[PDB]
Design a protein around this nucleic acid. Sequence first.
RNA 1: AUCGAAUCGCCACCUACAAGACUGGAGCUUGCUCCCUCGAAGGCGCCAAGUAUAUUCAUGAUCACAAGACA
RNA 2: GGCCAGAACCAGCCCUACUGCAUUAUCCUGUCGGGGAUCAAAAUCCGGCGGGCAACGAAGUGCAAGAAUGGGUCUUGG
RNA 3: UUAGGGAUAUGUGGCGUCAAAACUUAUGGGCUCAUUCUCGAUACGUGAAAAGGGUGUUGGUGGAUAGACAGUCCGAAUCCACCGGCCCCGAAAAUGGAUGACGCU
Lengths: 221, 96, 170, 178, 148
Amino acid sequence: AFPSRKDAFRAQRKGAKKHRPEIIVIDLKDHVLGRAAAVVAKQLLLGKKITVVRCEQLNIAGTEIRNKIKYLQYLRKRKLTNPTKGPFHHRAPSDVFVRTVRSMLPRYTKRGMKALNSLVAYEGIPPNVVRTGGRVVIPRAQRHVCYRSERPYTVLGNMCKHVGWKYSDVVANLEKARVEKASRHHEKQAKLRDAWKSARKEALAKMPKHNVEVLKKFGYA
Amino acid sequence: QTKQTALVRVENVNTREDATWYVGKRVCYVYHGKKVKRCVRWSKAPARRSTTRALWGRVTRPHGNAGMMRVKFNGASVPASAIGRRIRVYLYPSQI
Amino acid sequence: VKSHYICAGRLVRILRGPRQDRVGVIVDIVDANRVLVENPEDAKMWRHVQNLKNVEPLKYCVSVSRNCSAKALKDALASSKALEKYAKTRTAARVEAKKACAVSTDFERYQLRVARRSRAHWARKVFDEKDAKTPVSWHKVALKKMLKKAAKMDSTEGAKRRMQKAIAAR
Amino acid sequence: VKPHLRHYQVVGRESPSEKNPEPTVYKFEVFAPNFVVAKSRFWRMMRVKNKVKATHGDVLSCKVVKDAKLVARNYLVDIAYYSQRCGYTRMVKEFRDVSKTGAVSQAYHDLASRHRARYHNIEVLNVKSIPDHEVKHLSIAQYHAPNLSFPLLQRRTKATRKDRAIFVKKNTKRAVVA
Amino acid sequence: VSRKSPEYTTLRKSCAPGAIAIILAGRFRGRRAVILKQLPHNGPLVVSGPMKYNGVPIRRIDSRYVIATSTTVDISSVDTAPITAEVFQRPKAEKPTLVSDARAQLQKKIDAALIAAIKKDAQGKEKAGYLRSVFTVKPGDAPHRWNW
RNA sequence: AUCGAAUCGCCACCUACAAGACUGGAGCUUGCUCCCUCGAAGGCGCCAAGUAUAUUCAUGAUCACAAGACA
RNA sequence: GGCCAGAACCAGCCCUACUGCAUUAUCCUGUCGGGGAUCAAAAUCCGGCGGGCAACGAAGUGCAAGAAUGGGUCUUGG
RNA sequence: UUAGGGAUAUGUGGCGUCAAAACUUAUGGGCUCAUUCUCGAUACGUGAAAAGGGUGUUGGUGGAUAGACAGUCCGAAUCCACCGGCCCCGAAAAUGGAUGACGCU
Ligand SMILES: [K+]
Ligand SMILES: [Mg+2]
Ligand SMILES: [Mg+2]
Ligand SMILES: [Mg+2]
Ligand SMILES: [Mg+2]
Ligand SMILES: [Mg+2]
Ligand SMILES: [Mg+2]
Ligand SMILES: [Mg+2]
Ligand SMILES: [Mg+2]
Ligand code: NA
């Protein structure tokens, strides 16, 4: 993770600017676990770099007790003669999502592990991803289009916090701080947004007229 | 699998009609080797000398209903090290 | 509240299918899933059955009875002026613009790109004038905030002497 | 969607013989996916009611009875089905539909869903369009209210097949993978 | 008339003289040029797309590497008769910014005629700017769904 | 410093939030009516720093990894 | 050049576009009566009588034989 | 049902990912909620389940009573028997484990 002194020296010799690979950031809030996992696994196999945030806000259909019992049944699976090297039951919601995607991948080949290492999963939205660009959703895996609203559903964080996850409150406090900061930064820059909107409005009159008619033809002015 | 045919997913091609529109177009897979080998215009354009290589193919037919295409490369099949990597689908030969 | 109810006389837009983005009038409700839709003034919108998943109710409802005759529906639609009011709305204009862009040629796309770039350029000019007038951008806010401190810092005799000497040497 | 069953009128008789020089001609109406199935059901009915096999009979005509103009109507379908556990169960059900073929196809789907009955275990005794005031079930009569209004709640609206996207911006229509 | 005759051609109607064409491959990929004529014996197209406007000279190009748009320029006033396969023929070579005078004069005359034709046109300036434009495939573009 | 590489969309306007049994805002009549920004666009970018009067492009000779890439 | 590519055309083959003939009546349409519901109505529904082509791309009904006189062939040879 | 190879179509079986195919198709209808062998998706494969039961829900068949039933009169449907669909109870074993896995409502 921390770059080598060789890598930094080579970057200095080459003098190239900061490079960031093409990475899609998915806000997994109110997403169906299995459907988002299937879509993300297919996109990873297609060579895309995916970072998923707010994995504690994933949804599973059914009451929270039923899904807690499903997880505890999963936790029962251990190698009896040596629980070390037995199944490793990760309790964090991001680790749960990573496991689901890994199960939807050919994890025992170089191609599958290449796909799996292309996925980064977080709980909440950490600072290194807040300002990297607009986040996406998966329309075909969203809760308001997938579940009939009458039926109960589980929030992944609530289940994980009761099956052994320790950082529920830490993630909650971090998200509270992040949303407060982002709301402050968005109440600011309002003058900038209004200024740009009025600039476009005035440009609509300051520009040549046939261009305005062309914009009216294509529903832009 | 049968490696003599390859499957290519193109951005914004999500219907069988689009993949039909692409039937016959030239297809390129660009990669690099370890040494600088012979290329087109090796003598005419010495600026093209590079470790970069390319394998060429054509779109033969659409695959499925969702814009996937079947591609056959000239002679040899495309390497499996290209699975998940970029494929160039050019707009020629042009029928329009 | 809000939304627009499925009822006789309700104007709807077709969502998908070969009638996509066309407008008809709900003339009869079959059941929970299907309605009878007809629209004069449109050649393809004869009385046919639509699935309610494929319709989009609009904010207009011509007053008409269930299973109305063609003449009665046409008269009601003409008198209500529902089609005119719909054609004045921005979503109908967006639908027409989508059709125009679908049928557009390469030259029309060039003309659209030119017009959008011209509007962008003039928006930049207007923004620059207003931003010099009042510092709304990052660089102008930084400019004023550091310029006050810089004026205070360069009023020193040593600052002015060094500045003048180094400028003269330039 | 258009109904999967068509309204057929099969007209047939036993083949004329010396013993029966002028056999009776029977008109039989059936709802079948195609005319071969219509003839099959006709000959089954001829076998089970008149002791006339297909090997000794004629089919004079097998035509489709066209639907009327599509109008929201109440259809009474008198229908029966067989099960090993219960034998023959006859029921009379009312449906909202625009055609007799649509009403019968809906009845077949309803029998398949609520009783697990298949096409060849089902006999449609009669289908009739009835007035509103003869409708007995409230689940159908609720559609007779003159001011029948309802919103479209919990819609699952999918984009046009060309416009559909895998990844889209959260509060935006910009497709990132499509 | 006969496949042996030079006048024979199987070229699609879209690639007509005066049609503005998007160059798909080669040194001038993405540039928009004007189709002048087709060489005999069902030969390659010749485009100019004035070198003043987009820098494309008089040049051969196969019709399969060009998208012939529905926008056209009436170039009947342009004398395309001097354009012949002889001016594109190269001398045979011996064992082992530079333009010959004939090629330069042909380009100058043809470009003068083509600029006169383009300028003398309704939407002449828009078409000049169109020829100055560069065609590229953007992220999110679907050229298979477009008219040209 | 080997090193020639594959990758080909930028942004201090998206890069805040929440809900889809749901309004941008009202009314009472509660599903209709009336207002507004009319409720289907994140802004740029695609060859003149902007829509007009321009201006070097060749011979890299008809496709070849774009022979180039700090947008 | 007995090498690598592109395009053109020829023969063959493989895909696609381009559609006619029969049928419709338990149907279409006016009017009178009934009946229905309404606030009054129309409609859904049932009869009689009078006309008929539901013909917009009429029908998702039976059969179709329409000389590519547009693509592919790195699936064949030139 | 089988010489060595291409192309085009199918068979059985499938088209959320693993895994090619609906990038999770329709502008198709209904039904189902299942808490520690964790509902179901098991043709052959019985390679797992019954008798009996449920005022869970969704259908059907007869009978009835209609200022009815309940409530303390007062305004609209109510009651009885029976038979289905899916779900549930019945349903207990030994290494941690199997609709193939993940998941799916
Ligand atoms: K009457
Ligand atoms: Mg290169
Ligand atoms: Mg065998
Ligand atoms: Mg697949
Ligand atoms: Mg099995
Ligand atoms: Mg069994
Ligand atoms: Mg039992
Ligand atoms: Mg399982
Ligand atoms: Mg399986
Ligand atoms: Na919803």
